[PDB]
Every structure is written in structure tokens, then in C-alpha cells.
Amino acid sequence: PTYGVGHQPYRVVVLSFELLHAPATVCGPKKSTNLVKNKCVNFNFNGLTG
Amino acid sequence: VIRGNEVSQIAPGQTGNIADYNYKLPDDFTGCVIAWNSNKLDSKPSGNY
Amino acid sequence: YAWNRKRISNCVADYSVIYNFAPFFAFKCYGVSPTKLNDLCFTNVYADSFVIRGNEVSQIAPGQTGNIADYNYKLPDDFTGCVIAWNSNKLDSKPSGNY
Known about the structure:
mainly beta, Spike protein S1 (chain C), Spike glycoprotein, Glycoprotein, viral protein, two-stranded antiparallel sheet, part of a larger assembly, 3 chains, 50 residues, Trimer
């Protein structure tokens, strides 16, 4: 503990994400919206807007 | 748990000792790297061996 | 204002032992990278030593003006070197004042 800041301990936790290639299993807390058809609409299909 | 000098080595494209012999990140890495100092928990006057 | 320059030549140098000597965070480099510093051969290297405050470490960059960089230690616009900086409170400070 008397060492300098360059030799101080560091606890490193890294996260590795996986892009959408599978059915999505982890998503955020947003509530889903009922589907609409045959209308001009904004959509969000598992993070794919448009 | 790594030393404070090896924080910059945990990145895509880095080379050295930890990045070549302990833990290597891919070049197509997509994630977040979190590092925080732990001088209270992981340090001993006799040494955390 | 009275910084010393030491000439280093006619030797081989290993740059992986720098981190075990001083408690610094990381290198800052202009024109080169510290990872590939051991992969090529040079002609001459020099070492400069001085002590400044923590508010004036930003004046050790090329193309920067101020107080240290204007009248004490000015860097070239085509500087191709690496600058190491670390904190030293147990050696460069006194309770009575290191003047």
C-alpha cells in the first residue's frame, strides 16, 4: 500500500458483447407495443429502427 | 487483477506481456473496459502474494 | 530553467523495464508508439530531466504556449519523442517547503 500509483492494484472487469446473429436473450426494460400492419409506421425490431 | 501500468494493454491491437501471454482482446472487439483502483482490498503490508 | 541533457549512444536498449522503475500511468508519445519501440533501430537518443507542477504538464506538448513552454522548456513542432510524467510527493515536497 506504500507503493506509487503506477504499481497500485486495479480490479478490471470487462464486458464482451455479441452482435445480433441469434434470437436475442438479453434486452432492456422497455414495454412492447402491439403490432400494426398496412400503415406507414416507425418500428423497432430488437434494436433495428427504421 | 492487473497492475496499474497494464491498464492500457487491455485493448485491441495492444502488444506487451499481459496482452501476449496472459489475456488478449480481439481486433474486432465490441465491449466496455472497466478499471478501478483497489488499494484498500487487494493490498497488504506483507504483500498480496 | 537549468535542466540537464544526457547523451546515450553505442548501446542496446530494452524498453520493457521502464514500468518497473517509476510509478507512472502510461507513456505519452508523439510520432511513435510505445508498443513498437523495441522493434526498430535508432541513431541517437537523449534524456531530459526537470520538475514542474501538475498544472503545467500540459505545456510539454508540441505547438503549445504558456509559462513553462514559452520561457523555460519549449518543444519542437516536429517532435518525435515520448514524454514520461509521474507524481512524486514523498521526494519533491517537504512540510517546511521544498524551495
